[PDB]
Coordinates of C-alpha atoms in Angstrom, one line a residue:
Chain A
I27 CA 0.3 0.4 -0.1
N28 CA 2.8 2.5 0.9
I29 CA 3.9 1.7 -3.0
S30 CA 1.7 2.4 -3.8
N31 CA 1.0 5.9 -2.4
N32 CA 4.4 6.7 -4.2
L33 CA 4.0 6.0 -6.9
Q34 CA 1.0 7.8 -7.1
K35 CA 2.7 10.8 -6.3
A36 CA 5.3 10.0 -7.7
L37 CA 2.7 9.9 -11.5
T38 CA 1.4 13.4 -9.7
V39 CA 4.8 15.1 -10.0
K40 CA 5.5 14.1 -14.2
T41 CA 1.6 15.1 -14.8
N42 CA 1.8 18.8 -12.4
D43 CA 5.0 19.9 -14.2
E44 CA 2.6 18.1 -17.4
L45 CA 0.5 21.0 -15.8
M46 CA 2.8 24.4 -16.5
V47 CA 4.3 22.9 -19.7
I48 CA 0.7 23.5 -20.6
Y49 CA 0.0 26.9 -19.6
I50 CA 3.4 28.4 -21.0
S51 CA 2.3 27.3 -24.5
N52 CA -0.2 29.9 -23.8
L53 CA 1.5 32.5 -22.6
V54 CA 3.0 31.8 -25.5
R55 CA 0.3 32.1 -27.7
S56 CA -1.2 34.8 -26.1
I57 CA 1.4 37.7 -27.8
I58 CA 1.0 35.7 -31.4
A59 CA -2.6 36.5 -30.4
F60 CA -1.8 40.2 -30.2
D61 CA 0.0 40.6 -32.6
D62 CA -2.9 38.1 -34.9
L63 CA -5.5 41.4 -34.8
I64 CA -3.6 44.4 -36.3
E65 CA -2.3 41.9 -38.8
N66 CA -6.1 41.2 -39.3
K67 CA -7.2 44.2 -40.4
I68 CA -5.6 44.8 -43.8
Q69 CA -7.2 41.4 -44.8
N70 CA -9.8 42.4 -44.9
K71 CA -10.5 45.7 -47.0
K72 CA -8.3 43.6 -50.0
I73 CA -10.2 40.8 -50.0
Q74 CA -13.2 42.7 -50.4
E75 CA -11.3 45.0 -52.9
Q76 CA -10.7 41.5 -55.4
Chain B
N6 CA -53.5 17.7 -64.9
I7 CA -51.6 20.6 -61.9
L8 CA -51.5 17.4 -59.2
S9 CA -51.0 14.7 -61.6
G10 CA -47.3 16.3 -62.0
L11 CA -46.5 15.7 -65.8
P12 CA -47.2 19.3 -67.0
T13 CA -44.6 20.6 -63.6
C14 CA -42.0 18.2 -65.0
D15 CA -42.6 19.3 -68.6
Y16 CA -41.2 22.9 -67.4
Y17 CA -38.5 22.1 -65.8
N18 CA -36.7 20.5 -69.0
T19 CA -37.9 23.5 -71.1
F20 CA -35.7 24.9 -68.2
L21 CA -32.6 22.4 -67.8
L22 CA -33.0 22.5 -72.6
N23 CA -31.9 26.1 -72.5
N24 CA -29.9 28.2 -70.2
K25 CA -27.8 24.9 -69.9
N26 CA -24.0 25.9 -69.6
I27 CA -21.6 22.6 -70.3
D28 CA -17.7 21.7 -70.8
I29 CA -17.0 21.1 -74.3
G30 CA -14.1 20.9 -73.3
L31 CA -13.9 18.5 -70.2
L32 CA -15.4 15.4 -73.0
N33 CA -12.0 16.0 -74.9
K34 CA -9.6 16.7 -71.6
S35 CA -11.6 13.1 -69.9
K36 CA -10.5 10.9 -73.5
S37 CA -7.7 11.3 -74.3
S38 CA -6.2 11.1 -70.3
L39 CA -8.3 7.8 -69.4
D40 CA -8.4 5.6 -71.5
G41 CA -11.1 4.1 -72.3
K42 CA -9.6 0.1 -72.6
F43 CA -8.6 0.8 -69.0
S44 CA -12.0 -0.4 -67.8
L45 CA -12.2 1.9 -64.6
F46 CA -10.9 4.6 -66.8
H47 CA -14.3 4.2 -68.6
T48 CA -16.6 3.9 -65.4
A49 CA -15.4 7.2 -63.8
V50 CA -16.0 9.5 -67.6
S51 CA -19.1 7.2 -68.3
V52 CA -20.6 8.2 -64.9
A53 CA -19.0 12.5 -65.4
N54 CA -20.3 13.2 -68.3
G55 CA -24.0 11.7 -67.4
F56 CA -24.3 13.9 -64.7
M57 CA -22.6 17.0 -66.6
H58 CA -25.9 16.5 -69.3
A59 CA -28.5 15.4 -66.9
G60 CA -31.7 16.6 -66.8
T61 CA -31.4 17.4 -70.9
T62 CA -32.1 14.6 -73.6
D63 CA -29.3 15.0 -75.8
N64 CA -26.5 12.8 -77.8
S65 CA -23.7 16.1 -77.5
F66 CA -21.7 12.4 -75.2
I67 CA -22.5 9.7 -78.4
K68 CA -20.6 11.9 -80.8
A69 CA -18.1 13.4 -78.8
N70 CA -16.8 10.1 -77.3
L71 CA -17.7 7.8 -81.0
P72 CA -14.9 5.3 -81.0
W73 CA -14.1 5.6 -77.0
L74 CA -16.9 4.0 -76.3
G75 CA -16.6 1.1 -78.1
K76 CA -13.9 -0.1 -76.6
Chain C
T8 CA -18.5 -10.8 -75.8
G9 CA -17.3 -13.8 -75.1
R10 CA -17.7 -14.9 -71.6
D11 CA -16.5 -12.1 -68.6
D12 CA -14.7 -12.4 -65.5
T13 CA -15.1 -9.2 -62.7
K14 CA -13.5 -9.5 -59.1
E15 CA -13.1 -12.7 -56.8
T16 CA -12.0 -12.7 -52.6
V17 CA -11.5 -15.5 -51.5
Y18 CA -13.0 -16.8 -48.4
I19 CA -10.4 -19.4 -46.0
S20 CA -12.5 -21.3 -43.3
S21 CA -10.7 -20.9 -39.9
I22 CA -10.3 -24.8 -40.4
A23 CA -8.6 -24.4 -43.6
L24 CA -6.4 -22.2 -42.3
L25 CA -4.3 -23.2 -39.7
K26 CA -4.5 -26.4 -41.4
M27 CA -2.6 -25.2 -44.5
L28 CA 0.0 -22.8 -42.3
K29 CA 0.5 -26.4 -40.2
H30 CA 1.2 -28.2 -43.2
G31 CA 3.6 -25.9 -44.1
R32 CA 5.3 -25.0 -41.2
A33 CA 6.8 -29.4 -40.8
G34 CA 7.7 -29.4 -44.0
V35 CA 10.0 -26.8 -44.9
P36 CA 12.1 -26.1 -45.7
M37 CA 10.7 -28.6 -48.9
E38 CA 7.7 -26.9 -50.4
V39 CA 4.5 -28.5 -49.1
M40 CA 1.3 -28.7 -51.2
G41 CA -2.0 -30.1 -51.5
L42 CA -5.5 -29.6 -52.5
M43 CA -8.1 -27.4 -51.6
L44 CA -11.2 -28.9 -51.2
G45 CA -14.5 -25.9 -51.8
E46 CA -17.4 -25.2 -53.8
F47 CA -17.4 -22.2 -55.6
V48 CA -21.1 -19.8 -55.2
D49 CA -21.6 -16.8 -56.7
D50 CA -19.3 -14.8 -58.7
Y51 CA -17.4 -12.9 -56.3
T52 CA -17.1 -15.3 -53.1
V53 CA -14.3 -18.2 -53.4
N54 CA -15.3 -20.8 -50.5
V55 CA -11.9 -23.0 -49.7
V56 CA -13.8 -25.3 -46.5
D57 CA -10.4 -27.7 -46.1
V58 CA -8.1 -28.6 -47.9
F59 CA -5.1 -31.4 -46.9
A60 CA -1.8 -32.7 -47.9
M61 CA -0.3 -34.2 -51.1
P62 CA 2.8 -36.5 -50.2
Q63 CA 5.7 -34.0 -50.8
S64 CA 8.5 -35.2 -53.7
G65 CA 12.2 -34.1 -53.8
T66 CA 11.7 -32.9 -57.1
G67 CA 9.7 -29.9 -55.6
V68 CA 6.5 -28.5 -56.5
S69 CA 5.9 -28.5 -60.0
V70 CA 2.8 -30.5 -63.1
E71 CA 4.2 -34.1 -61.8
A72 CA 4.8 -33.9 -58.1
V73 CA 0.9 -33.3 -57.6
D74 CA -0.4 -36.7 -57.9
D75 CA -3.4 -37.5 -59.2
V76 CA -3.4 -40.6 -58.4
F77 CA -3.5 -40.9 -55.0
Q78 CA -6.2 -37.5 -55.2
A79 CA -8.8 -40.2 -56.1
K80 CA -8.1 -42.2 -53.1
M81 CA -8.6 -39.5 -51.7
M82 CA -11.8 -38.9 -53.0
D83 CA -13.4 -41.6 -52.0
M84 CA -12.7 -41.7 -48.7
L85 CA -13.7 -37.3 -48.0
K86 CA -17.0 -39.7 -49.8
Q87 CA -17.9 -41.8 -47.4
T88 CA -18.4 -39.5 -43.6
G89 CA -20.1 -36.8 -46.7
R90 CA -17.3 -34.2 -46.5
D91 CA -16.2 -34.9 -50.3
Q92 CA -17.5 -31.8 -52.3
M93 CA -15.7 -30.7 -55.7
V94 CA -11.4 -29.4 -55.5
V95 CA -11.0 -25.3 -56.5
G96 CA -7.2 -25.8 -56.6
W97 CA -4.1 -26.4 -55.1
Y98 CA -1.8 -24.5 -51.9
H99 CA 2.0 -25.1 -52.3
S100 CA 3.7 -23.2 -49.6
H101 CA 7.3 -21.3 -50.7
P102 CA 10.1 -20.7 -47.2
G103 CA 11.4 -17.3 -47.6
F104 CA 10.1 -16.3 -50.2
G105 CA 7.7 -13.9 -51.1
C106 CA 3.8 -14.8 -52.2
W107 CA 4.2 -16.0 -56.1
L108 CA 4.2 -18.9 -58.4
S109 CA 7.2 -19.0 -59.8
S110 CA 7.7 -20.5 -64.1
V111 CA 7.4 -23.7 -62.8
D112 CA 4.1 -23.1 -60.7
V113 CA 2.3 -21.3 -63.6
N114 CA 2.2 -25.2 -66.0
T115 CA 1.4 -26.2 -62.7
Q116 CA -1.5 -24.7 -62.5
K117 CA -2.2 -23.5 -65.3
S118 CA -3.7 -28.2 -65.9
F119 CA -6.3 -26.8 -62.4
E120 CA -7.5 -23.3 -64.8
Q121 CA -8.5 -25.6 -68.1
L122 CA -10.5 -28.5 -65.4
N123 CA -11.8 -25.4 -63.6
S124 CA -11.1 -21.4 -64.9
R125 CA -12.3 -20.8 -60.8
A126 CA -8.7 -22.4 -60.7
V127 CA -7.0 -20.7 -57.7
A128 CA -2.9 -20.7 -56.5
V129 CA -2.2 -20.3 -52.4
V130 CA 0.6 -19.2 -51.1
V131 CA 1.3 -20.0 -48.4
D132 CA 5.1 -18.6 -46.8
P133 CA 5.7 -19.5 -42.9
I134 CA 9.4 -18.1 -42.4
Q135 CA 8.0 -15.3 -42.8
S136 CA 4.0 -16.3 -40.7
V137 CA 7.0 -14.2 -37.8
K138 CA 5.0 -11.4 -37.5
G139 CA 2.2 -11.4 -35.5
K140 CA 0.3 -11.2 -39.1
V141 CA 0.1 -14.3 -41.6
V142 CA 1.2 -13.1 -44.9
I143 CA -1.3 -14.8 -47.5
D144 CA -2.2 -13.8 -51.4
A145 CA -4.2 -16.0 -53.9
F146 CA -3.4 -16.1 -57.8
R147 CA -5.2 -16.8 -60.7
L148 CA -3.8 -17.2 -64.0
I149 CA -5.1 -14.6 -67.0
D150 CA -5.1 -16.0 -70.3
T151 CA -2.4 -14.8 -72.5
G152 CA -5.6 -13.8 -74.9
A153 CA -6.2 -11.2 -73.0
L154 CA -3.5 -10.1 -71.5
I155 CA -3.3 -8.2 -75.3
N156 CA -6.5 -7.0 -75.0
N157 CA -5.7 -5.5 -71.7
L158 CA -8.7 -6.6 -69.5
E159 CA -6.3 -6.9 -66.7
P160 CA -8.8 -3.0 -65.6
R161 CA -11.7 -6.0 -66.4
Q162 CA -11.4 -7.6 -63.2
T163 CA -10.7 -4.4 -60.7
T164 CA -14.2 -2.3 -61.6
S165 CA -17.6 -2.9 -59.7
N166 CA -15.9 -1.9 -56.2
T167 CA -13.4 0.6 -54.7
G168 CA -12.1 -3.0 -52.3
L169 CA -9.3 -3.5 -50.2
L170 CA -6.4 -4.0 -53.0
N171 CA -4.0 -4.5 -50.6
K172 CA -0.7 -5.9 -50.9
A173 CA 1.7 -7.3 -48.4
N174 CA 4.6 -7.5 -50.7
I175 CA 6.1 -6.7 -54.2
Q176 CA 9.1 -7.6 -56.0
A177 CA 8.5 -10.4 -58.5
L178 CA 4.5 -10.7 -57.4
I179 CA 4.5 -7.0 -59.8
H180 CA 6.6 -8.4 -62.0
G181 CA 4.6 -11.6 -63.4
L182 CA 1.3 -9.9 -62.4
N183 CA 2.6 -7.8 -66.1
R184 CA 2.9 -10.8 -68.0
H185 CA -0.3 -13.3 -66.2
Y186 CA -1.8 -13.8 -63.4
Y187 CA -4.5 -11.4 -61.2
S188 CA -3.4 -11.3 -57.4
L189 CA -7.5 -11.7 -55.9
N190 CA -7.8 -10.3 -51.8
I191 CA -8.7 -12.3 -48.6
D192 CA -11.6 -12.5 -45.6
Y193 CA -12.1 -15.2 -43.5
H194 CA -15.0 -16.7 -42.5
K195 CA -15.5 -18.0 -39.8
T196 CA -19.3 -18.4 -38.2
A197 CA -20.2 -17.4 -34.4
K198 CA -19.7 -21.3 -32.9
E199 CA -16.1 -21.5 -34.0
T200 CA -15.6 -17.9 -32.6
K201 CA -17.0 -19.3 -29.6
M202 CA -13.6 -21.7 -30.2
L203 CA -11.4 -19.9 -30.9
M204 CA -11.9 -17.1 -28.4
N205 CA -11.5 -19.4 -25.3
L206 CA -7.8 -21.3 -25.6
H207 CA -7.5 -21.1 -21.0
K208 CA -8.6 -22.9 -18.5
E209 CA -7.4 -19.5 -16.4
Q210 CA -11.7 -18.2 -17.2
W211 CA -12.1 -18.9 -13.2
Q212 CA -8.9 -19.8 -11.9
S213 CA -6.6 -17.0 -12.2
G214 CA -8.2 -14.2 -10.9
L215 CA -7.9 -16.4 -7.4
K216 CA -4.6 -17.9 -8.4
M217 CA -1.4 -15.9 -8.2
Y218 CA 2.7 -15.8 -7.3
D219 CA 4.8 -16.0 -5.6
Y220 CA 4.5 -13.1 -3.1
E221 CA 8.8 -13.1 -2.7
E222 CA 7.8 -13.1 -7.0
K223 CA 6.0 -9.9 -5.7
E224 CA 8.8 -8.2 -3.6
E225 CA 11.3 -8.4 -6.2
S226 CA 8.4 -6.4 -8.7
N227 CA 8.1 -3.8 -5.8
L228 CA 11.7 -3.8 -5.5
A229 CA 13.4 -3.2 -8.9
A230 CA 10.3 -1.2 -9.2
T231 CA 11.2 1.8 -7.4
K232 CA 14.4 1.2 -7.8
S233 CA 15.2 2.4 -11.0
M234 CA 12.6 5.4 -11.2
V235 CA 14.6 7.1 -9.1
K236 CA 17.3 7.1 -11.7
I237 CA 15.0 8.3 -14.4
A238 CA 14.1 10.6 -11.8
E239 CA 18.2 11.4 -11.8
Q240 CA 17.7 12.7 -15.1
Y241 CA 14.8 13.8 -15.0
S242 CA 16.6 16.1 -13.0
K243 CA 19.4 16.8 -15.2
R244 CA 17.1 17.8 -17.8
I245 CA 14.7 20.7 -16.2
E246 CA 17.7 22.7 -15.0
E247 CA 17.1 23.5 -18.6
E248 CA 13.5 23.5 -20.3
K249 CA 13.7 27.5 -20.6
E250 CA 16.5 28.5 -23.9
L251 CA 15.1 28.2 -27.5
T252 CA 14.6 25.1 -29.4
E253 CA 12.0 22.2 -28.1
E254 CA 14.6 20.0 -30.6
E255 CA 17.1 21.4 -29.5
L256 CA 17.3 20.6 -25.9
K257 CA 16.0 17.3 -26.7
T258 CA 19.3 16.6 -28.3
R259 CA 22.1 18.5 -25.6
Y260 CA 20.4 17.4 -22.5
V261 CA 19.0 14.5 -23.5
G262 CA 15.6 15.1 -23.2
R263 CA 14.8 12.7 -25.7
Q264 CA 12.0 8.7 -25.9
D265 CA 10.6 11.4 -23.1
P266 CA 12.2 10.7 -19.3
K267 CA 9.0 12.9 -18.2
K268 CA 7.0 10.6 -20.3
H269 CA 9.3 6.9 -19.2
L270 CA 8.6 8.1 -15.5
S271 CA 5.6 7.8 -16.3
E272 CA 4.9 4.2 -17.8
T273 CA 7.3 3.0 -15.5
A274 CA 4.8 4.6 -12.6
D275 CA 1.4 3.6 -14.1
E276 CA 2.9 -0.4 -14.7
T277 CA 4.4 -0.8 -11.0
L278 CA 0.8 0.5 -9.8
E279 CA -2.7 -0.7 -11.7
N280 CA 0.5 -3.8 -11.1
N281 CA 0.4 -3.4 -7.7
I282 CA -4.1 -3.1 -7.2
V283 CA -4.3 -6.2 -9.0
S284 CA -1.8 -7.9 -5.7
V285 CA -3.9 -6.6 -2.7
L286 CA -7.1 -7.2 -4.6
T287 CA -6.6 -11.2 -5.9
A288 CA -4.7 -11.0 -1.6
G289 CA -7.2 -9.6 -0.1
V290 CA -10.3 -11.1 -1.9
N291 CA -8.6 -15.0 -0.7
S292 CA -7.9 -14.7 3.3
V293 CA -12.4 -13.8 2.9
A294 CA -13.8 -15.7 0.2
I295 CA -11.8 -18.6 1.3
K296 CA -10.9 -18.7 5.3
Chain D
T28 CA -28.6 22.2 -56.7
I29 CA -28.9 19.2 -54.4
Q30 CA -32.2 19.8 -51.7
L31 CA -32.4 18.4 -48.6
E32 CA -35.6 20.0 -47.6
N33 CA -37.9 22.9 -48.5
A34 CA -37.6 26.4 -47.4
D35 CA -40.9 26.7 -48.1
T36 CA -42.3 23.0 -45.4
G37 CA -39.8 22.5 -43.8
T38 CA -40.4 19.5 -44.5
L39 CA -37.4 16.5 -46.7
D40 CA -37.9 14.7 -50.0
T41 CA -38.1 11.5 -50.1
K42 CA -37.0 11.5 -53.4
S43 CA -33.1 13.4 -52.3
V44 CA -32.8 10.9 -49.3
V45 CA -33.3 8.6 -51.7
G46 CA -30.3 9.8 -54.3
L47 CA -27.7 10.0 -51.1
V48 CA -28.4 6.5 -49.2
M49 CA -28.2 5.1 -52.3
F50 CA -24.8 6.9 -53.8
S51 CA -23.1 5.0 -50.5
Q52 CA -22.9 1.9 -52.9
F53 CA -20.8 3.3 -55.1
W54 CA -18.1 2.6 -52.9
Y55 CA -18.7 -1.4 -53.4
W56 CA -20.4 -1.5 -56.2
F57 CA -19.7 0.6 -59.4
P58 CA -22.4 0.3 -61.9
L59 CA -24.5 1.3 -59.0
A60 CA -23.9 5.0 -59.1
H61 CA -26.5 6.6 -60.8
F62 CA -29.0 8.3 -58.0
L63 CA -26.6 10.5 -57.3
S64 CA -29.5 12.3 -60.0
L65 CA -32.8 11.7 -58.0
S66 CA -31.0 14.5 -55.3
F67 CA -30.6 16.9 -58.8
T68 CA -32.8 19.1 -57.9
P69 CA -33.6 21.2 -61.5
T70 CA -34.0 24.9 -59.1
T71 CA -35.5 28.1 -61.2
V72 CA -38.5 30.0 -60.5
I73 CA -40.8 29.6 -62.9
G74 CA -43.7 32.0 -64.0
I75 CA -46.9 30.5 -65.0
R76 CA -49.4 32.7 -67.0
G77 CA -52.7 31.2 -65.9
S78 CA -53.9 32.5 -69.1
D79 CA -52.2 29.4 -71.5
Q80 CA -50.2 26.8 -69.1
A81 CA -47.2 28.5 -71.7
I82 CA -44.5 30.3 -69.4
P83 CA -44.2 34.1 -70.3
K84 CA -41.4 36.2 -70.6
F85 CA -41.1 39.2 -68.9
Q86 CA -39.1 41.3 -66.2
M87 CA -38.6 40.9 -62.2
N88 CA -36.7 43.0 -60.1
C89 CA -33.2 41.3 -57.9
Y90 CA -32.1 43.5 -55.7
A91 CA -28.3 42.4 -56.1
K92 CA -25.1 43.6 -56.8
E93 CA -24.2 42.8 -61.1
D94 CA -21.9 40.8 -60.9
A95 CA -21.2 38.2 -58.3
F96 CA -22.8 35.3 -60.9
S97 CA -21.2 33.8 -63.7
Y98 CA -21.3 30.4 -65.2
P99 CA -17.8 28.4 -64.7
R100 CA -15.6 27.9 -66.5
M101 CA -13.6 26.0 -68.9
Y102 CA -9.2 26.4 -68.0
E103 CA -6.8 25.2 -70.3
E104 CA -2.8 27.2 -71.3
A105 CA 0.6 24.0 -71.4
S106 CA 2.2 26.5 -74.2
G107 CA 3.3 28.9 -72.1
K108 CA 6.1 26.2 -70.9
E109 CA 7.3 26.7 -74.9
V110 CA 7.5 30.5 -73.8
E111 CA 9.3 30.7 -70.0
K112 CA 12.0 27.8 -71.7
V113 CA 13.2 31.2 -74.9
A114 CA 11.9 33.8 -71.8
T115 CA 15.9 31.7 -69.6
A116 CA 17.6 32.1 -72.7
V117 CA 17.4 35.8 -73.7
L118 CA 18.0 36.3 -70.5
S119 CA 21.3 34.4 -69.4
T120 CA 22.5 35.2 -72.9
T121 CA 23.2 39.1 -72.3
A122 CA 25.0 38.1 -68.9
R123 CA 27.9 36.1 -71.3
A124 CA 27.5 39.0 -73.8
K125 CA 27.8 42.7 -71.8
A126 CA 30.8 43.4 -72.3
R127 CA 30.4 44.4 -76.7
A128 CA 26.9 45.8 -74.9
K129 CA 28.5 48.4 -72.8
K130 CA 30.9 49.8 -76.4
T131 CA 27.0 50.1 -78.0
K132 CA 25.2 51.8 -75.2
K133 CA 28.0 54.6 -76.3
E134 CA 27.2 55.1 -80.0
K135 CA 23.3 54.8 -80.2
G136 CA 21.8 57.4 -77.3
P137 CA 23.7 60.0 -78.3
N138 CA 21.5 59.9 -82.2
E139 CA 18.4 58.8 -79.7
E140 CA 19.4 62.9 -78.8
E141 CA 19.8 65.1 -81.1
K142 CA 16.6 62.8 -82.3
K143 CA 13.4 60.8 -81.0
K144 CA 13.3 58.3 -79.6
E145 CA 11.6 56.9 -82.6
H146 CA 8.5 58.8 -83.2
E147 CA 8.1 60.4 -80.0
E148 CA 10.4 63.2 -77.6
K149 CA 9.4 61.5 -74.6
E150 CA 10.2 58.4 -72.4
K151 CA 13.7 59.9 -72.6
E152 CA 13.5 63.2 -70.2
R153 CA 13.9 60.6 -67.5
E154 CA 14.1 56.6 -67.6
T155 CA 10.8 56.8 -67.4
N156 CA 8.7 60.1 -68.2
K157 CA 7.4 60.3 -64.6
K158 CA 9.1 59.5 -60.5
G159 CA 5.5 60.0 -58.4
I160 CA 4.1 57.4 -56.7
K161 CA 2.4 55.0 -57.9
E162 CA 0.5 52.5 -55.5
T163 CA -3.1 52.9 -55.4
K164 CA -5.4 51.4 -52.7
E165 CA -8.6 50.5 -52.4
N166 CA -9.5 50.7 -56.3
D167 CA -12.0 48.5 -58.3
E168 CA -15.4 46.9 -56.4
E169 CA -16.2 46.0 -52.1
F170 CA -17.8 43.4 -52.0
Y171 CA -16.3 39.3 -52.0
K172 CA -20.0 37.6 -50.9
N173 CA -23.0 38.8 -52.0
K174 CA -23.7 41.3 -49.4
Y175 CA -26.5 43.4 -50.0
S176 CA -27.3 46.0 -53.2
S177 CA -29.4 48.7 -53.0
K178 CA -28.6 48.5 -57.2
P179 CA -31.1 47.0 -58.8
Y180 CA -30.7 44.8 -62.5
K181 CA -33.6 42.8 -63.9
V182 CA -33.3 39.4 -64.5
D183 CA -35.7 37.4 -67.4
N184 CA -38.1 35.0 -66.3
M185 CA -36.9 30.7 -66.5
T186 CA -33.1 31.7 -66.4
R187 CA -31.1 30.5 -63.7
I188 CA -31.8 31.6 -59.9
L189 CA -29.7 30.2 -56.9
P190 CA -31.6 29.4 -53.4
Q191 CA -29.1 32.4 -52.1
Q192 CA -30.2 34.6 -54.9
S193 CA -33.8 33.8 -54.5
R194 CA -35.1 35.1 -51.6
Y195 CA -33.7 39.1 -53.7
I196 CA -36.6 38.4 -56.4
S197 CA -38.9 40.8 -55.8
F198 CA -42.7 40.9 -59.0
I199 CA -41.8 44.9 -60.6
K200 CA -45.7 46.9 -59.6
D201 CA -45.5 48.3 -62.9
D202 CA -45.4 45.1 -64.7
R203 CA -48.3 43.5 -64.6
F204 CA -47.4 39.9 -64.0
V205 CA -47.6 39.6 -60.0
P206 CA -48.4 36.4 -58.3
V207 CA -52.0 36.4 -56.8
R208 CA -50.8 35.7 -52.9
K209 CA -47.3 37.5 -52.6
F210 CA -44.1 35.3 -53.7
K211 CA -43.9 32.3 -51.3
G212 CA -39.4 33.6 -51.4
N213 CA -37.7 29.9 -52.8
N214 CA -38.0 28.9 -55.5
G215 CA -40.6 26.0 -57.5
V216 CA -42.7 26.6 -59.5
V217 CA -45.2 29.8 -59.2
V218 CA -48.5 31.1 -61.0
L219 CA -49.4 35.1 -62.4
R220 CA -51.6 36.5 -62.5
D221 CA -51.9 38.2 -66.0
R222 CA -53.8 41.8 -65.9
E223 CA -55.0 42.0 -69.3
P224 CA -55.9 39.0 -70.9
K225 CA -56.1 41.7 -74.4
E226 CA -52.4 42.4 -75.0
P227 CA -50.3 39.3 -75.2
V228 CA -46.3 38.6 -74.7
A229 CA -43.8 36.2 -76.4
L230 CA -44.3 33.2 -75.1
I231 CA -42.6 29.9 -74.6
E232 CA -43.7 26.7 -74.6
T233 CA -43.6 23.6 -72.7
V234 CA -41.2 21.6 -74.9
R235 CA -42.2 18.0 -74.4
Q236 CA -44.9 18.4 -76.9
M237 CA -42.4 20.9 -79.6
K238 CA -39.8 17.0 -79.6
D239 CA -42.9 15.2 -81.0

């Protein structure tokens, strides 16, 4: 039961790291998201012109 | 007469004949690239052209593809 | 028109499939062969019910190795038991080579093709059955006249079908200039299924049954000891994870195979195993006494 | 077009379901695939003048932009493959040639100055004749999807009208042929009320009787 306890807890370590990692992925993707909005302004007008 | 439905079909036939737009170039493009003695290629092209001239009794498909059908 | 053929798919029953394997493994390296007893229905289903094995020759597989004399004798023995029907071809077994018919096998086949036009030649590979998939393929001669008129397309139409391969090389050469290969489905009824599934007397004698606790102490000790080592690589590793490009980090500081994934797998396997080990342990103590 | 349900009554058509379920059995069998003609339904608004039960030509208004609809297409070009080949050739030849060309420019230019470029007194003042900006923006139409347009154009009866542009059809109040109630707003045969039977229009008869 004690080995099972350490192992459940080992799996929890691994997952809290995977929790932080995807959270960094989101922090990164935020920059891209901001930049995209200013950029889409230019594209809309061109496609309507054609 | 109306409820029998045969008039409504007649009205639709007049429409399909006149206002049809079709690719006369497709028939020749299909012909060269896909062979008729390769059976699989024939099957696709026969079903493809028929859909194209659907709705209107046409002999356009026979005359374009006169030798191709007999293979 | 003449007479116009289309696709067929050869349905090899459960009984026949094992029988072919049994015979082919045993006589190898020598080429082994045998006749197919079956019935032909539809225009798309060749039903191969049973096979049997013909005596082998040191002169391999050939026109004169089949033996029609032993066939006539074998036929009567099937006759009295209701297990005769009508012969639908032949099989032979190549060993390390692909599924394809040799020049000698064309001439063997041509004699079968006259007698019944719906004769198949079925190549078994037994030295290539060491995989989890048994490579088996079937062929059927297309007539010399037919190829000039390019009637191989004729056989392909009327379904998309699988158009499965499992071998090329020599196979595709031979295909051009002789035969048309047939895809394989296997038949089995809802009785045959249960027999197949059941391979244990450990259906009810495997949950209360267990391995000594010595062996469970070994699994526990190995498992805990190793996870330290995966944990020390993961510690060197995650001093990084803050530089440029994932792909670089993996090479240089050995992110390869993912040590994060490797520790999760090693923990998951022993974690699930011990719940079972206790679960069976306590079940016995409480129910038995 | 293939229509899945009436946009009037909101209720399935028998022909259309039967079309598509049979059509998927084409992957099992190449000759059974001719049920996709059931799926097709021609789409058009067809006015019927009730006088003679034959098709009037008269003009209905469409509020819609003018150019947003055309019949597709035809594709050809393979003489560009030739053209590309002789284009790359002249261009590499000039680099090889350069040594000679440089002297050539000495003699050529004074001759042009004293005279003319060819038969014009222009496009030798500068590199062209202008050096100003050439950039222009916000030119041509501003539509790429129909949207809505307050511009009208008139369309003939029994022409191809998609169901995506059938809803903008309006019947002219200076025109006699206008329906009994109001439009249903969707494709299908609509009966027209003729005000005067004492003024004819050229008609288009039923053609299943013109083939007899």
